[PDB]
């Protein structure tokens, strides 16, 4: 409808699959080559679906901050025949604050799924299912089962997946920029 939604579609469009494991489908970012991102407690294992099509994952990491805090990203490598478009210049360097973020879900159940949830906060700490969680975000939108994966943009930057909800807030891990050099 305007140029939030704009950058939001050009990220789904090419730089999102639908990713399934034992504990559900879930929209997948991928970041550059076979590298892609998706909520730790998806329990991704050696195997996974990939658009329905079976895919061994050549390596996942869990990634947890300096103090050995969990951030609920895993990094997945997947053995696929086609590299993702490289869009780790729309990854933020620093933590931040951000306004006017939309969140974008692609799934059997949510298909074309976008939704204006206003300001991000740099929420910082959550107790996310029972586990302490750093680097959150926080938008004021009453999300739901299914939209875990979900790509949160601004106009121009990628900022966050979807990992949960309180029934009035969500709640986004971080993406830095420094989770994806090589």
Same mark, same amino acid.
């Given at each position: 409808?305007?140029?939030?939604?704009?950058?939001?579609?050009?990220?789904?469009?090419?730089?999102?699959?639908?990713?399934?494991?034992?504990?559900?489908?879930?929209?997948?970012?991928?970041?550059?080559?076979?590298?892609?991102?998706?909520?730790?407690?998806?329990?991704?294992?050696?195997?996974?679906?990939?658009?329905?099509?079976?895919?061994?994952?050549?390596?996942?990491?869990?990634?947890?901050?300096?103090?050995?805090?969990?951030?609920?990203?895993?990094?997945?490598?997947?053995?696929?025949?086609?590299?993702?478009?490289?869009?780790?210049?729309?990854?933020?360097?620093?933590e931040?604050?951000?306004?006017?973020?939309?969140?974008? $879900?692609? /799934?059997?159940?949510?298909?074309?799924?976008? *939704?204006? %949830? =206003?300001?991000?906060?740099?929420? +910082? @700490?959550?107790?996310?299912?029972?586990?302490?969680?750093?680097?959150?975000?926080?938008?004021?939108?009453?999300?739901?089962?299914?939209?875990?994966?979900? $790509?949160? /943009?601004?106009?121009?930057?990628?900022?966050? *997946?979807? %990992? =949960?909800?309180?029934?009035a807030? +969500? @709640?986004?891990?971080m993406?830095?920029?420094?989770?994806?050099?090589?």
């Amino acid at each position: 409808m305007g140029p939030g939604f704009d950058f939001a579609q050009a990220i789904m469009k090419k730089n999102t699959v639908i990713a399934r494991t034992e504990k559900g489908e879930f929209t997948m970012l991928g970041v550059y080559d076979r590298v892609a991102v998706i909520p730790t407690h998806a329990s991704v294992g050696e195997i996974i679906y990939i658009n329905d099509v079976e895919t061994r994952v050549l390596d996942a990491c869990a990634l947890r901050d300096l103090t050995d805090t969990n951030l609920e990203i895993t990094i997945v490598k997947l053995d696929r025949n086609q590299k993702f478009r490289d869009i780790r210049h729309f990854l933020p360097r620093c933590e931040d604050d951000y306004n006017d973020a939309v969140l974008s $879900v692609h /799934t059997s159940k949510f298909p074309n799924m976008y *939704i204006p %949830v =206003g300001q991000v906060t740099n929420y +910082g @700490f959550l107790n996310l299912g029972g586990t302490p969680t750093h680097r959150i975000l926080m938008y004021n939108f009453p999300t739901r089962a299914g939209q875990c994966g979900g $790509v949160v /943009t601004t106009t121009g930057k990628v900022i966050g *997946i979807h %990992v =949960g909800g309180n029934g009035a807030q +969500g @709640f986004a891990a971080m993406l830095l920029h420094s989770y994806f050099t090589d």
